[PDB]
Amino acid sequence: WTATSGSCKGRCFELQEVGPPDCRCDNLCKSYSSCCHDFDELCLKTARGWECTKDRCGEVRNEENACHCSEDCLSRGDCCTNYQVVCKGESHWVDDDCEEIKVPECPAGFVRPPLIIFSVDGFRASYMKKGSKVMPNIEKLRSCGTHAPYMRPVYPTKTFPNLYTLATGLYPESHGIVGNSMYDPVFDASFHLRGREKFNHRWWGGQPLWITATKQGVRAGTFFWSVSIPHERRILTILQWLSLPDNERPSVYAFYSEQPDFSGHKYGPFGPEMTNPLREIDKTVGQLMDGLKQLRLHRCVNVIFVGDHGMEDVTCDRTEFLSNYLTNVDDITLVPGTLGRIRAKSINNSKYDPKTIIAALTCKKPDQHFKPYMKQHLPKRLHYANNRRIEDIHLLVDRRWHVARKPLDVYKKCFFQGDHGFDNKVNSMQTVFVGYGPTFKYRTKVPPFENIELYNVMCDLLGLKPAPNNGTHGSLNHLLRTNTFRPTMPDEVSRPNYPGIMYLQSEFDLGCTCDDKVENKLEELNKRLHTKGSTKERHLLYGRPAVLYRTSYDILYHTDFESGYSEIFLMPLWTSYTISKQAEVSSIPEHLTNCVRPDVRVSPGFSQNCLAYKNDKQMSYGFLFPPYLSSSPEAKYDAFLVTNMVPMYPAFKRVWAYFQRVLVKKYASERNGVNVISGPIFDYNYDGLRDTEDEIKQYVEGSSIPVPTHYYSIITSCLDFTQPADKCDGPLSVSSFILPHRPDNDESCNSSEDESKWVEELMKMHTARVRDIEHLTGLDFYRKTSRSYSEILTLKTYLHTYES
Ligand SMILES: *[C@@H]1O[C@H](CO)[C@@H](O[C@@H]2O[C@H](CO)[C@@H](O[C@@H]3O[C@H](CO[C@H]4O[C@H](CO[C@H]5O[C@H](CO)[C@@H](O)[C@H](O)[C@@H]5O)[C@@H](O)[C@H](O[C@H]5O[C@H](CO)[C@@H](O)[C@H](O)[C@@H]5O[C@H]5O[C@H](CO)[C@@H](O)[C@H](O)[C@@H]5O)[C@@H]4O)[C@@H](O)[C@H](O[C@H]4O[C@H](CO)[C@@H](O)[C@H](O)[C@@H]4O[C@H]4O[C@H](CO)[C@@H](O)[C@H](O)[C@@H]4O)[C@@H]3O)[C@H](O)[C@H]2NC(C)=O)[C@H](O)[C@H]1NC(C)=O
Ligand SMILES: CSc1ccc(C(=O)c2c(Cl)cc(Cl)cc2Cl)cc1Cc1ccc(=O)[nH]n1
Ligand SMILES: [Ca+2]
Ligand SMILES: [Cl-]
Numbered sequence: 001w002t003a004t005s006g007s008c009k010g011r012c013f014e015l016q017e018v019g020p021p022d023c024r025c026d027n028l029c030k031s032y033s034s035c036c037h038d039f040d041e042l043c044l045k046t047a048r049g050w051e052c053t054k055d056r057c058g059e060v061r062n063e064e065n066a067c068h069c070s071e072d073c074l075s076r077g078d079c080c081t082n083y084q085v086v087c088k089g090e091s092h093w094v095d096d097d098c099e100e101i102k103v104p105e106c107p108a109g110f111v112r113p114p115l116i117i118f119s120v121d122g123f124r125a126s127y128m129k130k131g132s133k134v135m136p137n138i139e140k141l142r143s144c145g146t147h148a149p150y151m152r153p154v155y156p157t158k159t160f161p162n163l164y165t166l167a168t169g170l171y172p173e174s175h176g177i178v179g180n181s182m183y184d185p186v187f188d189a190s191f192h193l194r195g196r197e198k199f200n201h202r203w204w205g206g207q208p209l210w211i212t213a214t215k216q217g218v219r220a221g222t223f224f225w226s227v228s229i230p231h232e233r234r235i236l237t238i239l240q241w242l243s244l245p246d247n248e249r250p251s252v253y254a255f256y257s258e259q260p261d262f263s264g265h266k267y268g269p270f271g272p273e274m275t276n277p278l279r280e281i282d283k284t285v286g287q288l289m290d291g292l293k294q295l296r297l298h299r300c301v302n303v304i305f306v307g308d309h310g311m312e313d314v315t316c317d318r319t320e321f322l323s324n325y326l327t328n329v330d331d332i333t334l335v336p337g338t339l340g341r342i343r344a345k346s347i348n349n350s351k352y353d354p355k356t357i358i359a360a361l362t363c364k365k366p367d368q369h370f371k372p373y374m375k376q377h378l379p380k381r382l383h384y385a386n387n388r389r390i391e392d393i394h395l396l397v398d399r400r401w402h403v404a405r406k407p408l409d410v411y412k413k414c415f416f417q418g419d420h421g422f423d424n425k426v427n428s429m430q431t432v433f434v435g436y437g438p439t440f441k442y443r444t445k446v447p448p449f450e451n452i453e454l455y456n457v458m459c460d461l462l463g464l465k466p467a468p469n470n471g472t473h474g475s476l477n478h479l480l481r482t483n484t485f486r487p488t489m490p491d492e493v494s495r496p497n498y499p500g501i502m503y504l505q506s507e508f509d510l511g512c513t514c515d516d517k518v519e520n521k522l523e524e525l526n527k528r529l530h531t532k533g534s535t536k537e538r539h540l541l542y543g544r545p546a547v548l549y550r551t552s553y554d555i556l557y558h559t560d561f562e563s564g565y566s567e568i569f570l571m572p573l574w575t576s577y578t579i580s581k582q583a584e585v586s587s588i589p590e591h592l593t594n595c596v597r598p599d600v601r602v603s604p605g606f607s608q609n610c611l612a613y614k615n616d617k618q619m620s621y622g623f624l625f626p627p628y629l630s631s632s633p634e635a636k637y638d639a640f641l642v643t644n645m646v647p648m649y650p651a652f653k654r655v656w657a658y659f660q661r662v663l664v665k666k667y668a669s670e671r672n673g674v675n676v677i678s679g680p681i682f683d684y685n686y687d688g689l690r691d692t693e694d695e696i697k698q699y700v701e702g703s704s705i706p707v708p709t710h711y712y713s714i715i716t717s718c719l720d721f722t723q724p725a726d727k728c729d730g731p732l733s734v735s736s737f738i739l740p741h742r743p744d745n746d747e748s749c750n751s752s753e754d755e756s757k758w759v760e761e762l763m764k765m766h767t768a769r770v771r772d773i774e775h776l777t778g779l780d781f782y783r784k785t786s787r788s789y790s791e792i793l794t795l796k797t798y799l800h801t802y803e804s
């Protein structure tokens with residue numbers, strides 16, 4: 001109960017939330033059902049509309065009006081946005097040529113340029129070009145400011161998870177807003193777009209920008225707008241707050257639009273009905289820019305025009321029904337739509353079996369427009385596992401499709417022609433970024449980047465120190481005219497040993513055999529030089545990766561490759577090698593098929609052994625530097641060292657071998673040489689961070705050899721591919737992946753065919769950023785290059801998406 005009988009007189013859109021049951025006049029009151037009796041009358045005036053006309057100029061002030069054309073309105077902070085255009089012969093912002101904003105041009109009392117986040121729901125990236133004719137204000141922002149061709153949302157590509165990511169720099173798995181709809185098993189509560197539950201603070205983790213600012217003495221406008229407050233009233237409230245006295249004025253503001261999303265759902269992303277909502281968004285941008293020009297703030301404020309996700313064509317008849325696949329369909333709860341999440345209908349039911357559910361959903365129809373996953377097997381790039389509100393069973397739905405439990409759910413629980421939510425690499429889910437202002441660059445295009453990076457940049461823009469987040473601070477420095485944040489490489493924590501030859505062969509009892517006793521003053525000196533790192537400049541092109549945690553490891557040099565060998569994990573943390581465009585593929589000689597050789601640099605005690613592999617009927621082994629790519633038959637012996645060996649399921653060995661035998665060589669051909677860094681990853685608790693030794697859940701039978709959950713590779717070349725990778729003067733080009741190390745290939749429905757019909761497809765699905773690899777390994781790459789550190793950070797956040 002609210003004593004809703006107090007008044008909003010004087011307090012319209014007050015910035016501090018008053019405590020109950022003293023009635024409210026802020027933005028959230030409509031939704032809390034707690035507005036004072038007179039809120040509508042005083043605070044949501046509409047009389048005379050939103051525009052000045054000739055006959056209103058120099059009028060006598062009438063307080064009932066929605067906005068004002070009286071002579072006193074500039075001082076009072078409440079003119080209609082077009083006031084000066086109509087009554088003072090001024091021009092609209094959009095009709096002024098753009099001029100570089102070299103320095104902030106702010107009124108006295110502004111301690112820093114304000115930041116305005118103009119946020120648009122469902123604004124697909126291609127609207128910038130396709131809708132350009134009807135969006136002149138937005139097109140001016142875009143061409144005069146800094147813009148990306150598109151911005152990558154987070155998964156799922158829904159509204160709430162993406163807005164809260166914008167505000168916190170965090171993956172949904174970390175901030176808690178894992179879907180537009182969610183069920184928490186501990187709260188026994190469901191969170192929904194509609195209703196009151198969403199307002200409880202227990203759902204909302206991390207630290208959003210308005211709180212970061214408040215805690216560091218920067219005041220903030222509301223980010224949440226009530227649906228029922230019209231857009232012209234949100235613009236006018238922002239411009240009013242901007243006329244408050246210096247001690248009361250916020251430095252950060254947000255404007256939110258439910259369009260074009262709302263129409264996109266009804267009409268599809270390019271329906272003819274979509275032209276008008278783009279015109280309307282444009283007009284709102286013109287209002288804000290006209291209002292800012294009135295207050296002399298249009299060369300002082302930094303504006304961000306940003307979307308939360310795009311919009312795809314999705315209709316009723318493109319629905320897959322779980323009832324066509326399962327028979328026990330009434331035992332599950334499905335969160336339906338452009339993604340699937342499945343859990344038991346009852347927790348008091350012990351019969352429920354995820355393995356049986358997954359099995360009934362895998363490769364059952366030729367055309368199947370979804371693919372089931374245990375959450376921990378989803379591509380690592382989606383970062384969508386480490387939260388109790390994310391169900392163990394996930395369905396990645398094909399773009400343009402929906403998943404539903406039963407047909408009754410679709411005709412009784414067509415209406416819609418668009419939707420979003422799909423994998424965040426899908427073109428049609430991409431969205432927009434433009435920054436315009438004194439702190440942004442002038443007329444600059446930047447590469448596509450992810451929305452998890454903006455929190456750091458908005459903190460920079462406001463002189464704030466960011467709460468810890470998943471952005472890579474520095475990676476967007478190239479957006480900004482003037483920096484504030486100077487990144488530095490993390491310090492190496494463990495330094496390597498460099499062992500020489502310390503062990504005689506007979507000290508090893510590893511149960512290994514090799515046919516290698518088939519053996520000069522010229523090339524006895526050479527192989528000794530190789531073992532001391534003579535070729536190391538060739539194979540380690542960017543310096544050794546730094547180990548950022550406490551551990552014990554050895555650098556091992558060879559003719560063809562270099563490695564960092566973990567004495568703790570009994571295998572390399574990283575193996576580095578260069579394959580030039582000219583290099584040849586050869587095969588494993590018959591006599592060397594089961595060859596594994598003890599490494600005289602590394603004790604028996606810190607080595608793997610062949611016997612464990614013999615005994616483990618599930619687990620075989622592969623090599624990190626491939627024998628196939630040896631530079632000489634003599635160099636090929638180095639690849640069979642026990643220290644180059646790693647545990648691999650035979651199912652996995654199919655993928656791995658195809659990558660090593662066919663794809664490295666193809667990439668080296670196409671890219672003019674490639675450098676490859678490969679290694680294992682341990683993430684048993686699926687938190688996207690490297691596992692400590694005591695977190696490992698699986699070992700090769702009867703040994704201390706831990707089993708990787710994933711295998712990575714980082715493949716680097718020269719962006720100017722007329723230069724060879726090993727002699728590149730300028731910017732680098734990278735693609736990487738993190739392959740799940742799985743004992744079957746159930747993920748790939750064509751896996752019974754030749755590897756050439758399915759392996760590359762899998763590897764594309766599991767494309768990764770270097771930065772994802774870094775979190776997963778505790779390593780830091782590219783420490784010695786000629787590139788600036790900012791550029792290197794951009795490079796480490798790059799994701800190769802394989803879309804067209
Ligand atoms: C993406 O970026 C983020 C942010 O950097 C990374 O996420 C961070 O990861 C850290 C390492 O895993 C993790 O550290 C934990 O945190 C434990 C403390 O937990 C609470 O406190 C957090 C701080 O809030 C305050 O922040 C500022 C200062 O920064 C203050 O001024 C304010 O006062 C703030 O309140 C808070 O963030 C955190 O929020 C989570 O939980 C909330 C409610 O439950 C949710 O609403 C919210 O969404 C967060 O939930 C996420 O994270 C949790 C795990 O924290 C996860 O389970 C969820 O699914 C979800 O993903 C909490 O409220 C701290 O106690 C931990 O310490 C243990 O381990 C260390 C190891 O060194 C030991 O030394 C230590 O003693 C302790 O061990 C003990 O406990 C063990 C397990 O409980 C037990 O086994 C053992 O025996 C011991 O008893 C540890 O430091 C951060 O909390 C986490 N932050 C967030 C927001 O997620 C993330 O990794 C990045 N992702 C990638 C891929 O890189
Ligand atoms: C830059 S606009 C922006 C940024 C972040 C957030 C939020 O984090 C948020 C909050 Cl604070 C409360 C709730 Cl219930 C849900 C969300 Cl997603 C909200 C908005 C705007 C908005 C969103 C939806 C809406 O109805 N009204 N306004
Ligand atoms: Ca982990
Ligand atoms: Cl959802």
Ligand SMILES: [K+]
Nearest residue numbers: 613616619620
């Ligand atoms: K075996």
Ligand SMILES: [Zn+2]
Nearest residue numbers: 122159261265
């Ligand atoms: Zn939507």
